[PDB]
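Ticket 4471: requesting a sanity check on a complex prediction with magnesium ion. Repro inputs:
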Amino acid sequence: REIVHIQAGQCGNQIGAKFWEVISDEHGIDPTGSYHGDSDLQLERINVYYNEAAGNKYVPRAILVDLEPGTMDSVRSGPFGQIFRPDNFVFGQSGAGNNWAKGHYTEGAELVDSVLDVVRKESESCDCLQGFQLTHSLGGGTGSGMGTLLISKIREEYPDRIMNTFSVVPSPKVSDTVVEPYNATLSVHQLVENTDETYCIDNEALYDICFRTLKLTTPTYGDLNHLVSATMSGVTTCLRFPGQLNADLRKLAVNMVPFPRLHFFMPGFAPLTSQYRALTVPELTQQMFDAKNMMAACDPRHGRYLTVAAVFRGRMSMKEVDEQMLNVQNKNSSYFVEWIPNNVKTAVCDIPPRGLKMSATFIGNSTAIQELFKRISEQFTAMFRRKAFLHWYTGEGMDEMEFTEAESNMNDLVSEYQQYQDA
Amino acid sequence: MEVIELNKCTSGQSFEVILKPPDPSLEEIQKKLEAAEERRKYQEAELLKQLAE
Amino acid sequence: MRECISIHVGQAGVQIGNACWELYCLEHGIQPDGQMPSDKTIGGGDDSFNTFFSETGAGKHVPRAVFVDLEPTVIDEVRTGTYRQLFHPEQLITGKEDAANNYARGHYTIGKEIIDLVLDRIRKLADQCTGLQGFLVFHSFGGGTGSGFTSLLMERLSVDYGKKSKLEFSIYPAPQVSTAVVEPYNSILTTHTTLEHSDCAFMVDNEAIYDICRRNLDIERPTYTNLNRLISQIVSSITASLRFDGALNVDLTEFQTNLVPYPRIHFPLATYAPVISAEKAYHEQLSVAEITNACFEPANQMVKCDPRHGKYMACCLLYRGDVVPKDVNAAIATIKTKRSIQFVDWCPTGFKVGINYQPPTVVPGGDLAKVQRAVCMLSNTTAIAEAWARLDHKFDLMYAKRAFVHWYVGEGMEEGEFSEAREDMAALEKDYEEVGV
Ligand SMILES: Nc1nc2c(ncn2[C@@H]2O[C@H](COP(=O)(O)OP(=O)(O)OP(=O)(O)O)[C@@H](O)[C@H]2O)c(=O)[nH]1
Ligand SMILES: Nc1nc2c(ncn2[C@@H]2O[C@H](COP(=O)(O)OP(=O)(O)O)[C@@H](O)[C@H]2O)c(=O)[nH]1
Ligand SMILES: Nc1nc(NCc2ccc3c(c2)OCO3)cc(-c2cccc3[nH]ccc23)n1
Ligand SMILES: [Ca+2]
Ligand SMILES: [Ca+2]
Ligand SMILES: [Cl-]
Ligand SMILES: [Mg+2]
Ligand SMILES: [Mg+2]
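Returned structure tokens:
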């Protein structure tokens, strides 16, 4: 039933806010929190993400976290900013200076208890909490360090609930500081241990999509975050609308994750919008499987698919959908592991997103994701072999040993992906 | 092909046509369920010990 | 008169139950409010339909049925739908959180907390029977609840009602409408744990029903409603002998006596004909000979397999409608000279035949046309073992990599149970080969 949403830091809070705008529009909820839709299908499972307050008001089940105030002031002034509950804003003053150790061990620790109090108050009033989703980046200090601290405390107090993240992975092509590879390696180590599902969103890929396909000479953060919000809408559609299926986050996890550590998913979206030509089912199918629509900069022909979910939205022929999904599997069979039968699953929702007649969202558990971690590992090593920029971290109390251990964990994850790719 | 044992009622009839001749007790169930629950307790305690470290 | 209690477990079992009880109401003339005007004995009786329906002093006819699910959303539709007044609330049992397609969560973790409540409500129904025969149990192989809770329940019913017969109706998994990869694990684990507790089990492969709906009803993409209405016709054909006057299969024990001489080999194949579309303008009606012939075509079977390459151990023909014995015997004589029907040597070559004069009922505004005569064949043939082979092959593929095993271990199951169940399946395939070849 109920999901609790958490957004931490600058990146996390910008994409989180965009997510709430898009889905609030789909459910017919305006910025004041009043329902003005045309169809009972919009409200029948509204309670998954929204609480009902007095006056038939709908309030997002959302907690907003940062170590500095700036971005949460921008949220509060943003177009839908009044819809969030005021008591759910939890912010410090110091900042974390793009420093994972400040987020995880010093500045963040002072705030974490007050954040957990609000989480507990939201969970306490849930009829039947299914679990949690977190939005954050891995390259900074607050979302990365404090986000993974939060993940650890939530597991300790709610050990049998599902913990899911949408995680933005750094790239030198879109970079704020040189230390991003350190912060990302430290964070992945935590995710391998403490999440059930992590959507890998690579700023490299989002940039290449804006540049090559959508034709934009200077992509802003706003342009990248538009794709992210559309993808997240796609991926939560099956819980959010009456589509026959009787599912919860745990049944989805059981269907998608064959080994506990290999739970990092590659998202995609079709069609890519910045037009009027409607799109045939063959075209949706061909484009959703195309490398160029993937949100993690990995070649799926360089690995094999452990599992795939496809979600189609809009009015279309289910016969034709089945035929096209079968066509792609039968003609490209070598990229799908033979030892998990029937590992491609398909959903259809009648309600299309805003501004499109037909769309498709892709979720892949592919061994080609090892390419992303290798990237990060090389950037890590190039600095760590000379200890460059380490004094920022040891000054907050960390030893070199912790860096060596994190590096080892991530090289092991890569080796595991390779083991299942050669089988 | 011998037709034998015809029976008849107001709602139908039946017959046969021949073409050719030729547990654990409650205690054990309870024990098994409790052993599984104990294994779950053990795994949960190992997790929480990791987190205290 | 001897009572029969039905138990519907998990999503598939509950929805199939709904279709069956709707059809029984239409066949017996019981309205959705429970009244039965043709019943002149108010507040009781030992008529044949009383095997399945009790009576209140107000003339309400109440199903002898329990619905059980671990989440509430499917049974709530029963609570609010057309037949809501038919069922007593204590008959409708729900939990808060489902088994997430995981046999171990259904059997161990969640089942342990609801099993005593379920047995208590069953006991409540049993205390109203003067000569309880046993149970009819409806479930999927693939769901966490249908597999794991059902097996737990079957063990406990053997403990608490050790003299009573138990029949199963089982939905075998098909990728064309399935939503999970782990269905083969759940199917093998539940078959292993239930095998000694079930006297007779009718397997229905969703793939066969899907293709019959597409080919013969002209439905482009069948839904669960289509599938369940057809399945409900077949179930009704099987239970009619318990619900109407007659001399064949009049009690649960007789199913085993007539169909199952080897206790582990207790999975009869069902074949049903004719299935004809309501939208089809004029239908030229099929004779006894043609519909009895249709029983030997694989396309009409509830499990796709080839009976020419196995052996028969028993056979029953259940006719409904305008049928006299002379035509049955003439059809059988013709069919024997044309088809490959070979029995095992220690069993006689023969058919037990039942005829009920009331034609089949159909649901108004449904996809099925009304016909003047129909037949269900129940044959115990070794060819059904092909389905076990298919499932076992898929199991072997995944277990060699231990794919998904951690989800089961984390609920407290030991890895050894996987291989105990698999080896029991290996011995079952061996039994069918030794008997059949
Ligand atoms: N024929 C038929 N099959 C169904 C129906 N509903 C579900 N199934 C099949 O049952 C299998 C899944 O089992 P479910 O009944 O949905 O699972 P469950 O018993 O409710 O257990 P949970 O996992 O706890 O929800 C799949 O193979 C489905 O195709 C139905 O109404 N009719
Ligand atoms: N896609 C995307 N990436 C962002 C956004 N804001 C920052 N980033 C990236 O996230 C990393 C910086 O982390 P940031 O969120 O600013 O740090 P924090 O405030 O301490 O959590 C760098 O990789 C940036 O390129 C955003 O709005 N969208
Ligand atoms: N694992 C997984 N898969 C998803 N895709 C669709 C799907 C459809 C039918 C399926 C299936 C998957 O698996 C078997 O049948 C979405 C999600 C998700 C994640 C995080 C937050 C979420 N809020 C709502 C949903 C969701 N999580
Ligand atoms: Ca301080
Ligand atoms: Ca009466
Ligand atoms: Cl008793
Ligand atoms: Mg920043
Ligand atoms: Mg269910």
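Notes from triage: Strands of chain B lie at 2-9, 12-20. Leaving this open until the requester confirms.
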